[model samples]
Target chain A: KPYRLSRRAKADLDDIWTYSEQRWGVEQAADYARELQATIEMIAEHPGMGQPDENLRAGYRRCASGSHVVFYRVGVRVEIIRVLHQSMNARAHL
Target chain B: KPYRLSRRAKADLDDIWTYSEQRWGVEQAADYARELQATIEMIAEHPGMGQPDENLRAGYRRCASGSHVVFYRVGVRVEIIRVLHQSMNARAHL
Candidate 1:
């Protein structure tokens, strides 16, 4: 399967990168973004890999990557719904 | 990661084959077994490719294969816990 990030997910990633750069450094932010990108590709090839959360939606799923959670759904392709901080409530953010 | 089936999982496969053979035929049973085997290898390569079910136990995850569900966990290796019919209640079986 292929994967694509939603507009919201892309915005979420941009926010994460900005926060990391400010909190740590540009280098750290780049590294963290690489990790999240790797995780997203892995999920795309194996879209079934995640914790299913029907409470959020019928096909919604989430997987943890470092300190963030990737919320997505499987369809024609892996649709990344959002990337949120681990502490954030997915129900509220998604 | 490499994968190894638990004793129970092996036994479950044996039972599946037997039931399939009796219900269908030897050829059909063999085909189903091959499909399950392929799915297992895919899971081994991508251990995170499954729906996490902590309700069953910490680290427990499941992915559908044909008419069955492969329950497993990621550790030193991908340890297949069981392969049960999709209609079965994983909570009760696990």
Candidate 2:
């Protein structure tokens, strides 16, 4: 099954796209999206790739795509819960 | 649009159902699930019904359905991120 992106994750992707495009250019944003896509696919193939985010919370795990953190859970399918800047405290929003 | 239940929220529902059935009965579990459904619908109609859980984090909002806390966000749809016992330290699990 395809990895499911939550509404918040979709919104985060929009923000990431807009920020990257405005800050740099289309090429950069596209590149970022590409890397994120690859990361997401990898996570889908190996749901346990991300270590359990025990400190942040239980039943959640996290992976990285460039400077962003991808929070997800392994279920019948991979569920992308949040996508945030690496510097952000995901424990709070997530 | 129908509300989206995150993987975590779905898992929580399973646990809630099991707990209620074992502790109370199937009737109690069904009742709880019914109430939760109503709350989810309310959130979908008024995504802002849940006040921002600022102490927990930015962008997140919360609502209560009986003894459970529903953590969600205002987005394209009502995304039920986490559902936890009210007495539990949701700040920790969420």
Candidate 3:
């Protein structure tokens, strides 16, 4: 099964990439993107790897990728709900 | 969203890897696996990209990845139902 990214998640990735590119460089941003992709792929292959967080949302699970947190859900396929920075309030964002 | 592989899908991937490894080499097998992953990722980002195949199953969609066909369905997430070689009978396997 393939993972699906929510609209918000896609937007989040764009924002993250833009921020990283400005703060670091294009190469750094690309590297970070690849890191996130690796994390997502790992999660997809192993849906049970994340920490369940019902407090955030029903059926929600989270995993950390570098400085960001990947929030997702496992139904028939993995749904990437959001990808936020570690310092951000996940509950508020989600 | 992360993709979740069904038990059958996982088994299919394992079998594919083993076969590829024996037929080609570990590196070639790994490369093919990455190709499949890339295709899966592409499908995940664009759920409506595949050709619908209700003839096979309700809500089923398919895309070709190298010599294999990826059968999937999109709900809350993208469910990869099966990955069968082009020469194989997809309907019979599914």
Best by lDDT: 3
lDDT of 1 by residue, A1-94 (tens): 4677799999999999998789768766786676577567756755654657787778987765545678889777889999887556434234
Count of residue pairs whose backbone atoms collide, per candidate: 1, 0, 7
Residue A91 error for model 3, in Å? Answer: 8.8
lDDT of 2 by residue, A2-76 (tens): 888899999999999998789768866776676567667756765664656776776787765545668898667
- lDDT by residue (B2-75, candidate 3, tens digit) is 87677898788899899878977787678667757766775676566566777777898775554466789987
lDDT of 2 by residue, B57-86 (tens): 667877655456677886677788988864
Off by over 4 Å in 2: A90-94, B1-94
* Alpha-carbon deviation at A38 in model 1, angstroms: 1.1
What TM-score does chain A of model 1 get? 0.89
The per-candidate TM-score of the B chain, in the order shown, comes to 0.88, 0.86, 0.89
Question: How well does candidate 3 match the true structure in TM-score terms?
Answer: 0.48
For each candidate, give the interface RMSD after superposing the true interface residues on Cα. 11.4, 16.8, 14.4
Off by over 4 Å in 3: A89-94, B1-94
* Per-candidate TM-score against the hidden true structure: 0.48, 0.47, 0.48
**Candidate 2: docking tier:** incorrect
Q: Of the candidates numbered 2 and 3, which has the greater TM-score value?
A: 3
